[PDB]
Every structure is written in C-alpha cells, then in structure tokens.
Design a protein around this motif. Structure first.
Motif, mmCIF file in Angstrom:
data_model
loop_
_atom_site.group_PDB
_atom_site.id
_atom_site.type_symbol
_atom_site.label_atom_id
_atom_site.label_comp_id
_atom_site.label_asym_id
_atom_site.label_seq_id
_atom_site.Cartn_x
_atom_site.Cartn_y
_atom_site.Cartn_z
ATOM 1 N N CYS A 23 36.343 59.701 -40.113
ATOM 2 C CA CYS A 23 37.535 60.541 -40.100
ATOM 3 C C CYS A 23 38.767 59.739 -40.514
ATOM 4 C CB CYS A 23 37.743 61.092 -38.692
ATOM 5 S SG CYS A 23 39.167 62.223 -38.511
ATOM 6 N N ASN A 25 41.479 59.679 -39.257
ATOM 7 C CA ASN A 25 42.151 59.144 -38.069
ATOM 8 C C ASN A 25 41.821 57.679 -37.812
ATOM 9 O OD1 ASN A 25 43.615 61.507 -37.383
ATOM 10 N ND2 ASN A 25 41.926 62.310 -36.143
ATOM 11 N N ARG A 30 48.489 61.041 -39.214
ATOM 12 C CA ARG A 30 49.026 62.277 -39.792
ATOM 13 C C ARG A 30 50.518 62.136 -40.093
ATOM 14 N NH1 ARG A 30 49.080 65.646 -42.051
ATOM 15 N NH2 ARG A 30 49.756 67.447 -40.807
ATOM 16 N N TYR A 62 43.155 67.734 -38.158
ATOM 17 C CA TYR A 62 42.563 66.437 -37.793
ATOM 18 C C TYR A 62 42.962 65.993 -36.398
ATOM 19 C CZ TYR A 62 40.810 66.137 -42.450
ATOM 20 O OH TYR A 62 40.140 66.398 -43.622
ATOM 21 N N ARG A 152 36.571 63.096 -47.369
ATOM 22 C CA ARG A 152 37.880 63.678 -47.105
ATOM 23 C C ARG A 152 38.850 63.471 -48.272
ATOM 24 N NH1 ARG A 152 36.853 67.496 -43.540
ATOM 25 N NH2 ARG A 152 36.587 66.815 -41.355
ATOM 26 N N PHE A 187 44.456 65.783 -46.037
ATOM 27 C CA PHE A 187 45.040 65.076 -44.901
ATOM 28 C C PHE A 187 46.433 64.532 -45.230
ATOM 29 C CE2 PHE A 187 44.611 62.568 -40.986
ATOM 30 C CZ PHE A 187 45.411 61.454 -41.223
#
Ligand SMILES: C[S@@+](CC[C@H](N)C(=O)[O-])C[C@H]1O[C@@H](n2cnc3c(N)ncnc32)[C@H](O)[C@@H]1O
Ligand SMILES: N[C@H]1C[C@@H](O)[C@H](O)[C@@H](O)[C@@H]1O
Ligand code: SF4
Ligand code: SF4
Length: 246
Positions: A23, A25, A30, A62, A152, A187
């Motif tokens: 991910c 993250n 963000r 996310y 992603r 994202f």
C-alpha cells in the motif's frame, strides 16, 4: 451522454492504522488529511440524492473507515438520502467487533469487504468465527494473499480487453476535501476533475476532462496519462457495477 458512475468511493477519513508493504501508506502520506467535514458529506448526499443514485457507495480511499469518528453519522445519512444505493464497507477489520458490525449493518451497510493484512493477526478472526449466519453472510473475508496486487498507478515498485480500463467509466472517488478523482489508484491526485463543494458531481462527471479521460482509457491508451502509464491494474474492464474485485 456517458452513463453515470455506478460506484462511488468516499474518503471519509484519510488515515489508517496499518502500513502494508503493498500500500502507498508504506511509502508516502496522503496529500489531504483529516476526517470529512460533515457539511461536505451532506453536500455529497444532496447531490447523489438529486441523481437518484442507486449504485454502490463505499467509504475508503487509503485509510481505515472504522477510524472515522463520524462513520455512524455518515452511514445513517447514506440511508436517509440515497436509500436505493448499496453501502459497502472495505475495512482491515482490526476495529471490527460484532457490536460494531451490527450497528453498521442496522444503519445501512449491506456488505463488509474485510481483509486480514500482512502483519499482526487481528481480533476479527475470532469474532468472525463466532458470528451468527445472518451477520456472517454479510462479510466477504479475504486474506491479503487473495488480492490481485496492483502497483497503485505505479507508486509501488515491489509489485511486478488487454490494457483497456473501465474504472473512470464506472467509478468516482471523492477525497476528504471533496476533490473528485477518476480512479481509486490516484493516491497522488494527478487527475483531479473538480470539487463537489464548487460544482455538482454530475457536472464534474460529464465535463470534458472526465469524458475525454474515460474514453481514452476505455480504448486502452494508458500511455497517454501520467496516472495510468505504469499502472498494472486490469481488474476493471467491463461496464458493470461491482461489490469488489480481487
Ligand atoms: C486501499 S484498501 C482501503 C480500505 C482498508 N484500509 C482495507 O485495507 O481494507 C482498499 C481495498 O484494496 C485492497 N488492497 C490493498 N492494497 C492493494 C493492492 N496493492 N492491490 C489491490 N488491492 C489492494 C485492500 O485489501 C482493500 O480491500
Ligand atoms: N480491488 C479493490 C481495490 C480498491 O482499492 C478499490 O477501491 C475497490 O473498488 C476494488 O474493488
Ligand atoms: S489496511 Fe488498507 S489502507 Fe491501511 S495500509 Fe493496509 S491496504 Fe493500506
Ligand atoms: S489504468 Fe490504472 S490508474 Fe488508470 S484508470 Fe485504470 S486502474 Fe486507474
């Protein structure tokens, strides 16, 4: 005139308690953070209501929706404004107790897409094993090993109809500040289409930028976009509304 989106995914809170290696993250933050202003969520509900929206609505980008302090409020408002819509929560399940599941179901959640992610085994394992059938039937319980991992939009390097893509023909994302994106892979918000606080989502959906982008991707021209050029996601290639794809 292009079909309205059949699916909308709303960033009601930006943050997550995990940092999965697959991910963004795990490697970025963000660019918008916080929890959605209740007045902005209301604006979104008013707009979806005005369109008789009856597709899927979900509550993540996310982050982990069960961290949203106003989740109960927002699910309840969904049922009030767009009773024909299908509310589906994707969640890591780390905060999902039986009581929480039942409250959410009562407020309007029709399905939970729960993923056990890399790392610590969550308590939902034992909760799920003890659920009555009626509750259990509302849960799709996935392991991260079941996912078809996307990079992603090329953010993740550790991740290795043809190239057609229908996401921007079928789906819209609304970020915590109300910005509309054409895909959940965005994202970094490379393709902001408009903001629902400034324009009706219908007008955003039908504007030249969005219309041109969805036609382009339907034809498989990923190479024409900074968002799509390195994207390996081929999970959404038909016109159909879905609950989830792996
Ligand atoms: C970004 S997660 C957000 C919601 C919540 N944090 C969760 O993990 O369920 C949305 C969905 O995508 C799945 N997912 C996470 N990383 C993915 C990846 N790299 N490729 C495809 N799906 C992924 C998650 O399991 C979850 O079902
Ligand atoms: N495979 C998942 C990926 C997730 O990020 C999207 O938000 C969801 O719509 C898809 O079903
Ligand atoms: S739990 Fe969901 S949002 Fe959080 S890091 Fe993992 S995939 Fe990303
Ligand atoms: S090609 Fe990838 S980034 Fe572009 S719209 Fe499709 S899924 Fe999203």
């Amino acid at each position: 005139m292009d079909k309205l989106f059949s699916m909308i995914e709303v960033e009601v809170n930006s943050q997550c308690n995990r940092t999965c290696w697959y991910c963004p993250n795990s490697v970025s933050k963000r660019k918008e953070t916080g929890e959605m202003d209740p007045a902005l969520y209301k604006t979104l509900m008013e707009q979806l209501s005005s369109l008789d929206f009856a597709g899927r609505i979900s509550f993540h980008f996310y982050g982990e929706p069960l961290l949203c302090k106003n989740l109960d409020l927002f699910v309840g408002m969904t049922t009030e404004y767009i009773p024909r819509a299908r509310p589906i929560i994707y969640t890591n399940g780390d905060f999902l107790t039986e009581k929480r599941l039942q409250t959410l179901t009562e407020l309007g959640i029709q399905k939970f897409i729960v993923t056990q992610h890399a790392g610590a085994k969550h308590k939902f394992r034992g909760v799920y094993d003890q659920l009555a059938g009626a509750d259990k039937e509302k849960v799709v319980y996935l392991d991260h090993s079941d996912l078809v991992l996307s990079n992603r939009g090329g953010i993740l390097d550790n991740i290795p109809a043809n190239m057609s893509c229908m996401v921007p023909s079928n789906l819209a994302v609304v970020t915590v500040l109300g910005n509309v994106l054409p895909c959940f892979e965005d994202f970094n918000q490379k393709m902001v289409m408009g903001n629902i606080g400034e324009q009706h989502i219908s007008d955003i959906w039908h504007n030249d930028k969005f219309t041109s982008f969805r036609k382009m991707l339907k034809e498989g021209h990923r190479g024409k976009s900074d968002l799509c050029k390195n994207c390996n996601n081929v999970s959404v290639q038909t016109e159909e509304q879905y609950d989830y794809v792996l």
